[PDB]
Amino acid sequence: RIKKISIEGNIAAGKSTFVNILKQLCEDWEVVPEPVARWCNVQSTNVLQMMYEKPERWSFTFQTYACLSRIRAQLASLNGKLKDAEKPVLFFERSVYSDRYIFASNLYESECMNETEWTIYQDWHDWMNNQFGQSLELDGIIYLQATPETCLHRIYLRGRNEEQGIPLEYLEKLHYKHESWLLHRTLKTNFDYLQEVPILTLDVNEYESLVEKVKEFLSTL
Amino acid sequence: RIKKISIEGNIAAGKSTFVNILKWEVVPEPVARWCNVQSTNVLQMMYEKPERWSFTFQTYACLSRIRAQLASLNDAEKPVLFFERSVYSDRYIFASNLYESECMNETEWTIYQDWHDWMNNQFGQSLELDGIIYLQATPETCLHRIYLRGRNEEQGIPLEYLEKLHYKHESWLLHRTLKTNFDYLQEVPILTLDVNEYESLVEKVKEFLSTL
Numbered sequence: 152r153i154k155k156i157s158i159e160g161n162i163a164a165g166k167s168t169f170v171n172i173l174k175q176l177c178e179d180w181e182v183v184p185e186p187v188a189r190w191c192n193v194q195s196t197n198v199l200q201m202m203y204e205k206p207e208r209w210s211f212t213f214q215t216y217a218c219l220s221r222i223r224a225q226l227a228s229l230n231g232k233l234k235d236a237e238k239p240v241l242f243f244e245r246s247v248y249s250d251r252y253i254f255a256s257n258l259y260e261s262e263c264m265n266e267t268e269w270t271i272y273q274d275w276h277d278w279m280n281n282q283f284g285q286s287l288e289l290d291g292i293i294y295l296q297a298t299p300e301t302c303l304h305r306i307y308l309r310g311r312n313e314e315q316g317i318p319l320e321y322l323e324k325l326h327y328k329h330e331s332w333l334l335h336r337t338l339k340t341n342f343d344y345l346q347e348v349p350i351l352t353l354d355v356n357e358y359e360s361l362v363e364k365v366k367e368f369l370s371t372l
Numbered sequence: 373r374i375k376k377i378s379i380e381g382n383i384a385a386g387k388s389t390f391v392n393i394l395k396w397e398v399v400p401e402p403v404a405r406w407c408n409v410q411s412t413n414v415l416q417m418m419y420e421k422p423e424r425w426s427f428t429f430q431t432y433a434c435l436s437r438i439r440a441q442l443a444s445l446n447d448a449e450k451p452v453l454f455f456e457r458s459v460y461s462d463r464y465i466f467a468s469n470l471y472e473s474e475c476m477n478e479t480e481w482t483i484y485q486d487w488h489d490w491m492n493n494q495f496g497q498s499l500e501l502d503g504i505i506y507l508q509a510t511p512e513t514c515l516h517r518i519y520l521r522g523r524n525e526e527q528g529i530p531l532e533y534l535e536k537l538h539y540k541h542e543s544w545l546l547h548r549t550l551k552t553n554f555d556y557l558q559e560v561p562i563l564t565l566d567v568n569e570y571e572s573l574v575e576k577v578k579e580f581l582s583t584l
């Protein structure tokens with residue numbers, strides 16, 4: 152009944168800035184940003200910061216928390232307003248896929264998670280979506296493509312204290328998973344429907360010609 | 373439509389030996405999957421370095437428990453299902469104690485509870501207990517039964533540990549002074565049996581299930 156699109160992209164690619172521009176267009180368009188605020192406020196502690204400072208200790212914990220929260224937030228917004236509008240479209244800021252096959256996954260491929268952790272993570276992640284996740288099936292994906300050099304430079308522009316330590320080699324590994332997943336679509340997941348899902352890739356390396364393609368996309372959905 | 377009872381007790385109190393005599397179906401603790409996570413023992417990992425894997429182990433432990441019990445009761449005349457420990461003992465006894473022992477920081481403990489609460493706010497209402505059987509035993513006895521069972525990981529557990537777990541048990545099942553976030557439990561019947569020392573227990577049990 153409700154068209155669900157996911158906005159994907161590397162760190163600082165411009166996910167949010169795009170999300171916001173979208174909101175101001177159709178009153179039937181709502182958006183669900185990442186609970187990033189909670190991640191940074193867990194009883195006066197920053198679990199996001201805790202992971203960047205000692206990844207091989209809090210990666211598991213942070214990725215568990217991050218996905219759990221995301222499912223809650225999104226499950227919440229699809230049972231809210233817009234649940235009456237003629238053309239109900241909901242934009243998600245990143246999904247439970249990017250969370251597992253990009254960020255989490257990369258952490259494991261960097262020894263920042265042992266076999267025990269990674270095993271548990273996937274076991275957990277699979278179950279979570281096998282229940283209250285089918286309602287979160289995506290109908291499309293918007294890919295915000297940008298060079299890892301641009302993301303690195305945009306990290307300073309946003310000036311988030313925790314992210315200021317991120318090396319290029321890191322954004323480079325995340326950037327590859329992105330390409331390999333939504334560009335060449337060679338990356339495979341356990342959720343087969345995604346193979347049939349439409350991907351709109353936009354070059355955001357450099358403000359209305361994007362709105363253009365977007366509409367043509369949502370219509371062909 | 374199905375009576376759900378939970379068998380509670382300290383480590384090595386005799387939970388399983390009692391569960392078997394009872395067998396009415398039973399849902400054993402997922403101890404198996406706990407010791408086998410891709411050729412690794414996450415249970416062993418916790419006892420060896422508690423302040424590093426307590427969180428991870430407790431998250432996994434409860435998740436698995438909910439799964440096992442959920443598919444369990446998912447059709448006879450007198451349907452009774454016995455649970456080997458519950459999601460309560462998991463959070464208000466074991467996990468809880470680990471946090472009261474610095475084996476979990478504020479970050480972990482906060483996340484745990486947040487998670488635990490959500491988990492049962494969904495597919496947990498079907499797991500509401502109708503009663504609880506308390507297997508009471510002295511910490512000294514549990515310690516001695518640890519050797520009798522001879523589980524490699526548990527052989528390092530000191531008395532002070534068992535004693536703590538023991539008090540959380542008494543506080544929660546005998547004294548009824550440990551409040552939780554699941555109020556119905558305050559109305560739930562508790563059958564306490566002294567298992568410190570094999571058919572007189574079956575006796576009380578039946579009288580219990582009838583008064584349910």
Ligand SMILES: Nc1ccn([C@H]2C[C@H](O)[C@@H](CO)O2)c(=O)n1
Nearest residue numbers: 162185187217249250254255314
């Ligand atoms: N699954 C996720 C989601 C987000 N982040 C991080 C990257 C950014 O620093 C911040 C913003 O999304 O969160 C992460 O490591 N893993």
Ligand SMILES: Nc1ccn([C@H]2C[C@H](O)[C@@H](CO)O2)c(=O)n1
Nearest residue numbers: 383401403430433462466467526
């Ligand atoms: N939430 C739980 C449940 C059980 N155990 C331990 C105690 C025993 O050593 C073994 C069997 O229950 O697992 C634990 O540490 N935490």
Ligand SMILES: [Ca+2]
Nearest residue numbers: 191192195196
């Ligand atoms: Ca703060």
